[PDB]
């Protein structure tokens, strides 16, 4: 869809394509976090530290519970197509309607959670499942260290150690709970997603994306000191005929001035569609981008025509900083503005001259065996695959002040035109 | 002031109003933080850890002291209206003049602080006041645990524990001191504002705002290892005849295209004033917004007239992303662009058709008992309170490139007009 060859002549470089994997559906699993560990010691040791630790957790559990309880409600309360509920008074956007429908879907789950928590209260396992998974904050450290310490050291000796261990956990909890992403909880409990949920070898990119999806707090229990979250696990599917391209713009020469074509960082082609992509929220893998939804957006017709090979329509702006590159390697050769950048062919002993009417010089292995950029001699790649007077008239400005100054000039010319019309009507 | 009813026809939705509480005045109280705890043990235990801890605090106390000492001075040194001081050479903006006047007001307080610190050096209370309040970093943990450990365990055993406890406190200090907000200090010392200052049942929103106000370091003592801050406690007052409204724009249909009215997230009405509000720095309560100063700002006359009911002046822009909602619940009914969104009345069995000349469909309980959005059947609210050919000509673009491309077209038309004028003057 993109004329990669012609764009090089205007300094627009298109990188290697990558497909797209989109999260069409999500598996929903509930994670219960129990913040109070169980000290199995029959001598009731550590109870004083746990009492103090409870007082410290309140600084987090109470704010969360208050925020949830006072959250506005947009739907108030079967068949495959029955009415979900009644529209609550107020204004609710599509995002709030979708989020509320998700909370309604969890109504049946909440009734189950209330029964499972009773068994979590007296269990001493670090990670337990009945899927619904429950993790105790420090139960693993307690069982492996604090439990055997009581049999060897005094209760006082390792009682203080339990205090410091719990204090560290509070510092981590307040870091993540003080939105929430699954990576935060996974790091807090130092446990992998594959160890938490036994559901399905997948690439590191897929796990990194799963750890990036947000989690929402469905309820908080002030009596058992437990917090439960809804975790969404994505089902990635490759979107056929979808390509994401990276666009890099180099400096372009026009009458000894430096210009560049302003384009989005990433552009996408999907069948007949051509436009930018907001990959800032996506994960980039070796061969595809993993996104939560289609990142495409509609571009200006001049940019869409520019990328379709009509390079005379490409917008151009003056280069005002050193951020814009002046040379780049392309398919085994060098593409650079050889006027402001010293380009040498087959050695530094000779400089290739770029005529003032040419904006970008394309150097290929068929011409120069070695290319030197600012003295950096490089060997061309033999496997690389890298006379038209192109003129670009769509000059554009990226700042509102420049446009305003130009608009004031246009308004002044309009006044002169109106005055000349008045003069013509009066004299004629 | 706002014609909420007419704005719905253009897709502009105004949410439930909230008043405004503004901080007209502030109470000033000084907080002294003493970083070195006092170990009451007569055997001088823990002294080695304290010596090491002092060396670690220098990495924070010295940078702060150097920054304060080298800070530029804009005022150099009674009666109810005497001269504050002499203007120092240089340039000082209003913010710096105000901040400097605040430091001058603290001159008398600093003279008092220098005498109070002497008593703080030998006291062993965690929180003490003489108002001026002083808090010792770990004195509470030392008295409740490290002091009784010496009587039971050896000095070596719990000496190492004191080291780890102090090390944790340093990691927290460098997190907040490495501006500063009172919430940070409150979290660092795990103490509530009501426990620190005994001054006045107030709502959680008021305390959350008090914890949001910034605190400034007035002085640092390198000998006693103490830092003192000036804390401002706000006196909230309800600003009568002040309302803040939330504005949500949905997609609007024009000849099968999707348009939306770009408006600020929040708009304010204050007597005769109508304009946007920068609530990003404010706290949102159940019935009012708590702000440090009036967040209002002047809007463009076209937006001010649009919100005043002259919907023909509303600016409109093309929808270029899925962020802009396409349906929203309003006062118990559904307001949606039923062309791109499937709207069903009294069941999915029939779709309501929206004529191409109508931009937004308003569905009320008086017409459809149940409304289905993309198959999501919802029951209308019986208590809800939800034929004009409106045309919007003020098309606007939100990006500088589009405006530049349109401006280039206008300039080309100006050149053609000037040429036609030249031709007319030459021929006639």
């Amino acid at each position, epitope marked *: 869809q993109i004329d990669i060859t012609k764009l090089q002549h205007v300094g627009v470089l298109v990188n290697s394509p990558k497909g797209m994997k989109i*999260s*069409q*559906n*999500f*598996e*929903t699993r509930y994670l219960i976090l129990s913040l109070i560990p169980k000290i199995e010691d029959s001598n009731s040791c550590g109870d004083q530290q746990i009492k103090q630790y409870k007082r410290l957790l309140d600084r987090l559990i109470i704010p969360l519970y208050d925020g949830l309880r006072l959250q506005k409600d947009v739907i108030v309360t*079967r*068949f*495959f*197509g*029955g*009415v*979900i509920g009644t529209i609550a008074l107020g204004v609710a956007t599509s995002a709030q309607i*979708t989020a509320a*429908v*998700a909370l*309604v*879907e969890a*109504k*049946q*789950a909440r009734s*189950d959670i209330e029964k499972l928590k009773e068994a979590i209260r007296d269990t001493n396992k670090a990670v337990q499942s009945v899927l619904i998974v429950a993790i105790k904050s420090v139960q693993d450290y307690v069982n492996k260290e604090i439990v055997p310490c009581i049999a060897r050291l005094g209760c006082e000796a390792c009682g203080l150690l339990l205090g410091l261990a719990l204090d560290q956990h509070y510092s981590e909890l307040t870091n993540i709970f003080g939105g929430i992403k699954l990576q935060g909880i996974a790091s807090l409990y130092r446990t992998n997603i594959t160890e938490i949920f036994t559901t399905s070898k997948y690439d590191i990119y897929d796990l990194l994306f799963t750890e990036s999806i947000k989690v929402r707090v469905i309820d908080v229990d002030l009596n058992d000191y437990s917090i439960t979250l809804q975790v*969404r696990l994505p*089902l990635l599917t490759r979107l056929l005929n979808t390509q994401i391209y990276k666009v890099d713009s180099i400096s372009y020469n026009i009458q000894n001035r430096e210009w560049y074509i302003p384009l989005p960082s990433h552009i996408m082609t999907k069948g007949a569609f051509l436009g930018g992509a907001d990959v800032k929220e996506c994960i980039e893998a070796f061969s595809s981008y993993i996104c939560p939804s289609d990142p495409g957006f509609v571009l200006n017709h001049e940019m869409e025509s520019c990328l379709s090979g009509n390079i005379s329509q490409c917008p151009r702006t003056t280069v005002t900083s050193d951020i814009v590159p002046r040379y780049a390697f392309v398919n085994g050769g060098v593409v650079a503005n050889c006027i402001t950048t010293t380009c040498t062919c087959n050695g530094i002993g000779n400089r290739i001259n770029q005529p003032p009417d040419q904006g970008v010089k394309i150097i290929t292995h068929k011409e120069c065996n070695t290319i030197g950029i600012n003295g950096m001699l490089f060997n061309t790649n033999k496997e690389g695959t890298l006379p038209d007077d192109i003129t670009l008239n769509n000059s554009v400005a990226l700042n509102p002040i420049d446009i305003s100054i130009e608009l004031n000039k246009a308004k002044s010319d309009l006044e002169e035109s109106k005055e000349w019309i008045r003069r013509s009507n009066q004299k004629l | 002031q706002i014609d909420i009813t007419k704005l719905q026809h253009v897709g502009v939705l105004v949410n439930s109003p909230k008043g405004m509480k503004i901080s007209q005045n502030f109470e000033t109280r000084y907080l002294i933080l003493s970083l070195i705890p006092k170990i009451e043990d007569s055997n001088s235990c823990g002294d080695q850890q304290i010596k090491q801890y002092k060396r670690l605090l220098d990495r924070l106390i010295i940078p702060l002291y150097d920054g304060l000492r080298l800070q530029k001075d804009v005022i150099v040194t009674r009666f109810f209206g005497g001269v504050i001081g002499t203007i120092a050479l240089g340039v000082a903006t209003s913010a710096q003049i105000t901040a400097a006047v605040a430091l001058v007001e603290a001159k008398q307080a600093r003279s008092d602080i220098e005498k109070l610190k002497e008593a703080i050096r030998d006291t062993n209370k965690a929180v003490q006041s003489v108002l001026i309040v002083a808090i010792k970093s770990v004195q509470d943990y030392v008295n409740k645990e490290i002091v009784p450990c010496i009587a039971r365990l050896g000095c070596e055993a719990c000496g190492l524990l004191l080291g780890l406890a102090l090390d944790q406190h340093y990691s927290e200090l460098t997190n907040i001191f490495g501006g500063i907000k009172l919430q940070g200090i409150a979290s660092l010392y795990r103490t509530n504002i009501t426990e620190i200052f005994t001054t006045s049942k107030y709502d959680i929103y008021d305390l959350l705002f008090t914890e949001s106000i910034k605190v400034r370091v007035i002085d640092v003592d390198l000998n006693d290892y103490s830092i003192t801050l000036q804390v401002r406690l706000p006196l909230l007052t309800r600003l009568l005849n002040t309302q803040i409204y939330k504005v949500d724009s949905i997609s609007y249909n024009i000849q099968n295209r999707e348009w939306y009215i770009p408006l600020p997230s929040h708009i304010m009405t204050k007597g005769a004033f109508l304009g946007g509000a920068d609530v990003k720095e404010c706290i949102e309560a159940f019935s009012s917004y708590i702000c440090p100063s009036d967040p209002g700002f002047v809007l463009n006359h076209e937006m001010e007239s649009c919100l005043s009911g002259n919907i023909s002046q509303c600016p409109r822009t093309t929808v270029t992303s899925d962020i802009v909602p396409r349906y929203a619940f309003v006062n118990g009914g559904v307001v949606a662009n039923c062309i791109t969104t499937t709207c069903t009345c009294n069941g*999915i*069995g029939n779709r309501i058709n929206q004529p191409p000349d109508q931009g937004v469909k308003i569905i009320t309980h008086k017409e459809c008992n149940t409304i289905g959005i*993309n*198959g*999501m*059947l919802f029951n209308t609210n019986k208590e809800g309170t939800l034929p004009d050919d409106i045309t919007l000509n003020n098309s606007v673009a939100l990006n500088p490139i589009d405006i530049s491309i349109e401006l280039n077209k206008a300039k080309s038309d100006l050149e053609e007009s000037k040429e036609w004028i030249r031709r007319s003057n030459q021929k006639l």
Partner: nanobody
Amino acid sequence: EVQLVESGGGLVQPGGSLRLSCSASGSLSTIKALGWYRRAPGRERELVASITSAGETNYADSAKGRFTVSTDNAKNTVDLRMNSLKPEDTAVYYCYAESFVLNIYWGQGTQVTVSS
């Protein structure tokens, strides 16, 4: 949570017919579509059929004009009628429920085999 119970699988002679049923229970008012998926030994799961609450029905490339699906809202059942089976149709079929918020739920799965 939507619990799905499948039934009707087993062995069938080539060219015969089979009826697969899936019973759903839960907050079905939130489920957007109900359908069937297939996994074959050595490949991932693929869509077979799905029916929306409005009765709109779509099929796979291999199921177009060959299979049918139906629902009964009153007795809350999902039925799959299998006709003109081929030796390549032996696989494991699953019934699924898709929510308006893109949540998907799977049943226990039933194996369908066809004689050579």
